[PDB]
Structures are given as structure tokens and as C-alpha cells.
Design an enzyme around this catalytic site. Structure first.
Site, PDB file in Angstrom:
ATOM      1  N   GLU B  49      55.541   0.400  70.468  1.00 45.87           N
ATOM      2  CA  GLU B  49      55.793   1.505  71.376  1.00 45.87           C
ATOM      3  C   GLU B  49      55.888   2.819  70.611  1.00 45.87           C
ATOM      4  OE1 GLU B  49      55.720   0.993  74.482  1.00 45.87           O
ATOM      5  OE2 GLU B  49      56.172  -1.130  74.800  1.00 45.87           O
ATOM      6  N   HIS B  86      71.415   0.048  62.066  1.00 46.33           N
ATOM      7  CA  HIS B  86      72.584   0.535  61.342  1.00 46.33           C
ATOM      8  C   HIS B  86      73.723   0.784  62.324  1.00 46.33           C
ATOM      9  CE1 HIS B  86      71.318   1.909  57.083  1.00 46.33           C
ATOM     10  NE2 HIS B  86      70.480   0.969  57.486  1.00 46.33           N
TER      11      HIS B  86
END
Lengths: 91, 87, 92, 87
Positions: B49, B86
Site C-alpha cells: 500500500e 516501535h
């Protein structure tokens, strides 16, 4: 209203959209535009390409954690500045 | 086999982490990189995407339900911004 | 396995169905916070969502896209939930 | 018209800043708070919208093109998370 960069919002009413539905599906896919279809009763909808929807949800997912968002921002800033690691890797 | 890849500092640290501790993940990442190389940035495995907002110009592919390979392609060279989420 | 906002459900319909039942689908996405992927023979598909959910997504994106603003909001909402707050009478 | 408002620490600092240095903005904020009180969280000026993701349960109204009033309503009491965009 707010619109993704490179996109343009088009306003059409319902009778029109149902008559020209296939043409509008082509339009939002080809030109990355979006169509607000209006209803007499203000129960309106927005039509976007499946790709643009997936892009928005993917962007949301990645940005929604401030720490991941900062990790992406710093890393893209690093890449643009040549602050990088170049390695040959085997598959 | 050989594929020249440009990592960001933090993406590389995560890649090296996966190398020692999660070889299931390095294999997946490597397969995604091969697919990007062969098919282009928007074709192949991992549900590629285009990203928007400040990530404009980059792409996502799924390493698994959680982690994304975030990357771009510049003069046919692959650049990796991230390969691990993260927190 | 596509992504979908909390409390939303993605429905898949094909073009013929969607064109016949457009009004019913416009009602459905507005009433129940659902979204409709309309398919086409050539996979040039679309997603239909309520204008409100659209504005919600873009407003959420706008507020979250700057990590510093996102952190300010997350911290502030955490403060409010824990009662680390300032309550003041303001004349309005 | 006395209105009891609960602020987050950072939202209060920004409100106080607007109080001293930008009167048109504190006026607009106060108007949005009045509209929330009379009309409810999703009705009135400022284009009220429900927020999603980790902002679920909160709403935003436009102070101007840039700044948002981010708030919620708890037992008919208004709580402000933000009234100024942080960079």
C-alpha cells in the site's frame, strides 16, 4: 473538509450517484478523488477507492503510536540525508 | 541472492535483532524484499500500500499482523525505513 | 484481513447489488457505523463510509500525524482519566 | 455565565496563554464551550466530530483552521484535553 494531499472531494446527490455509480467508481480509482454523495435527509456517504481506504488505515495504524510515528519520521529523515547503512544481503 | 539494500539506522538495528533472535521474521522480510525487487513497489506479496501524510512516498507491506516493512524505491534501489513496530 | 476502525464492520457487496440498493447502503453505513466495499469485475473497487466516519478518520489523522501533538493528546487524556487536572470556573 | 470546566494541565497552560496573548482565540474557545454545554458534544458550531483510535471517547471542534478543541463530556461536565496544536 479535510482531504488527503493530491486528492479532491467531489459532491454529488443520490439520484445522480446511483445512476452514474460505475462512472464514479472509475473516477475515484483513476484520479484518487473522493465523492460525497448527499441525501435529502443529510445521511450522506463518502466514496473512495479501496486502495485509498487501505492507504488511510495503514497510515493511521503506523502513525497512531507516537513512538512508532517518531521512529518512522526520524528514519525517513535519515534516509533522505544519506545517514544510512548499506548492506548486501542474500535472500 | 545478493541484493543491495539501504537501511535507516533504526531499521538496520531491528533487522540485525531479527537475525539473531527471530529467523522466521528475517525470512519473511527477505521474501518481501525479493518481491519488491522483482515486481515493483506496488505488486506482490504482503499487501503493498502507498502511505499518505508525512509518510508520502513510502509504502507498507505486512511482515505479519503486527509489523510492517516500510520502504521506498529510488532509481530501482530499495530503501528500508522500518521493519519492526516501535512502542 | 483489512483494517477497520473500532466498532465498525466491513461488508462486501458487488456493483450490481450496490447500484440497486444504494440508498439502503447509505442508510446502513450511517446507522450502524459499518463500511461497504463494493467490488467490480475489474477489481477497481470502492469503499463507502458515512460522511461522519470519514470526517472522524481525517480529524483523527490530522491530530495524530505530528508525534508531538499525538503525545500531548495521549498525555492529556491520561491526566484527565487519573484526575491530575485543573478545574476552574470560567465566564462564558 | 459561570461554566465549570475541567482542564488537562497542558490544555490549561495553553488556555492561560491565549488569555494573555490572543483574545480572539480565547473568545472562540469560550464560544465552543458554551455551544457544547447547551447543545451537547455533537451539536453546534465548530464542526463537532467523534475521534477514533486512542482518542476514542473524545471529540474535536475547530477553533480555527489549525487549532482544535479536543474534549469529552462526563456526567454533563466538560473536560478539555487540548485547545492548541502542539509541534
Amino acid at each position: 473538509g479535510l482531504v488527503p494531499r493530491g486528492s479532491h472531494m467531489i459532491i454529488k446527490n443520490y439520484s445522480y450517484a446511483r445512476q452514474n455509480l460505475k462512472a464514479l467508481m472509475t473516477k475515484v480509482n483513476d484520479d484518487s478523488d473522493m465523492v460525497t454523495v448527499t441525501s435529502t435527509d443529510d445521511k450522506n456517504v463518502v466514496i473512495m477507492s479501496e486502495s485509498d481506504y487501505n492507504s488511510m488505515m495503514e497510515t493511521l495504524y503506523l502513525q497512531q503510536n507516537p513512538n512508532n510515528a517518531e521512529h518512522l519520521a526520524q528514519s525517513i529523515a535519515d534516509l533522505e540525508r544519506g545517514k544510512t547503512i548499506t548492506k548486501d544481503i542474500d535472500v | 541472492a545478493r541484493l543491495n539494500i539501504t537501511f535507516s539506522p533504526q531499521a538496520f538495528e531491528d533487522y540485525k535483532y531479527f537475525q539473531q533472535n527471530n529467523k522466521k521474521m528475517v525470512k519473511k522480510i527477505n521474501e518481501l524484499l525479493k518481491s519488491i525487487d522483482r515486481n515493483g513497489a506496488l505488486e506482490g506479496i504482503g499487501k503493498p500500500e502507498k502511505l499518505k501524510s508525512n509518510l508520502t512516498g513510502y509504502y507498507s507491506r505486512r511482515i505479519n499482523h503486527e509489523h510492517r516493512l516500510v520502504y521506498t524505491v529510488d532509481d530501482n534501489h530499495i530503501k528500508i525505513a522500518s521493519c519492526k513496530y516501535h512502542y
